[PDB]
Amino acid sequence: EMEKEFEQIDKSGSWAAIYQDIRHEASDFPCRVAKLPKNKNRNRYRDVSPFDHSRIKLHQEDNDYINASLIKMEEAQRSYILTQGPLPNTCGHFWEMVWEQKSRGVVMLNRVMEKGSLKCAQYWPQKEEKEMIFEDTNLKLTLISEDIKSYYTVRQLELENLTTQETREILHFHYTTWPDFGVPESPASFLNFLFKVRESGSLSPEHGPVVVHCSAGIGRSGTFCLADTCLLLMDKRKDPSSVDIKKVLLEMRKFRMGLIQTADQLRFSYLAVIEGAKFIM
């Protein structure tokens, strides 16, 4: 099964090589829109861009460009939007997308500043009393509630389309304890967090796709979507042991580049599926 391939890779000390191989096989599609002069200041990283074919279009005339991708896992019957941490000038765009795609949950896997480097802007209100309004997108955002746990925080937010005065409740899942160096020792907490997200309703087909981000929306974000997808696959196929993580990762990389950023994140991803499988069994 999979816990053995994990061991085959382990005694071999080949994590870096499998990581190397996946990176060698990853698909490569144009990102012409992302690279247009007008969009330079809409990308955190010049080397992390959404492919043209799966990019999320904002519904406005000025410029529909946001660095965000629709990952559509057809067999698993789940879609995700992976996106970079919002920039100071793309916060309105971000909430615009959330509104337009009709997402119920935003999944955050980073801290705004990490090891002295800004990874994303403070895109949501830290205080119930100081709601935020994004003038460019005509949206208002209010912190309703916040439940802090040891390794993560869940917040209830009210996003108000200041144009229909419609309002939606957005759930914000913030994983606050990813370590500065490496990956978590145990996946338990990561899986618990995933489960909380599943339990909330955020991943149901009844809603638009969950939006997941980190700094670039590919390392940590890919780990989350990889783990989730692989579990679904296991549940669906009726020969669970048929699920090849390298294969689901490669299929994910058709929708967005660089998913899973280090060999250590790939090993953590395998760790998370096995234990998640075990727990579920």
UniProtKB/Swiss-Prot annotation:
Any one Gene Ontology molecular-function term assigned to this protein's record: ephrin receptor binding
Keyword Membrane (UniProt): yes
Cysteine persulfide found at: 214
Example of a GO biological process term: platelet-derived growth factor receptor-beta signaling pathway
Residues found modified as Cysteine sulfenic acid (-SOH): 214
Catalytic activity, as annotated: O-phospho-L-tyrosyl-[protein] + H2O = L-tyrosyl-[protein] + phosphate
Domain spans labelled Tyrosine-protein phosphatase: 2-276
Entry keywords, A to Z: Acetylation, Endoplasmic reticulum, Hydrolase, Membrane, Oxidation, Phosphoprotein, Protein phosphatase, S-nitrosylation
Keyword Plastid: no
Broad class of where this protein is predominantly found: endoplasmic reticulum
EC category name: hydrolase
An example Gene Ontology CC term for this record: protein-containing complex
Family: Belongs to the protein-tyrosine phosphatase family. Non-receptor class 1 subfamily.
Function: Tyrosine-protein phosphatase which acts as a regulator of endoplasmic reticulum unfolded protein response. Mediates dephosphorylation of EIF2AK3/PERK; inactivating the protein kinase activity of EIF2AK3/PERK. May play an important role in CKII- and p60c-src-induced signal transduction cascades. May regulate the EFNA5-EPHA3 signaling pathway which modulates cell reorganization and cell-cell repulsion. May also regulate the hepatocyte growth factor receptor signaling pathway through dephosphorylation of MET.
Protein name, per record: Tyrosine-protein phosphatase non-receptor type 1
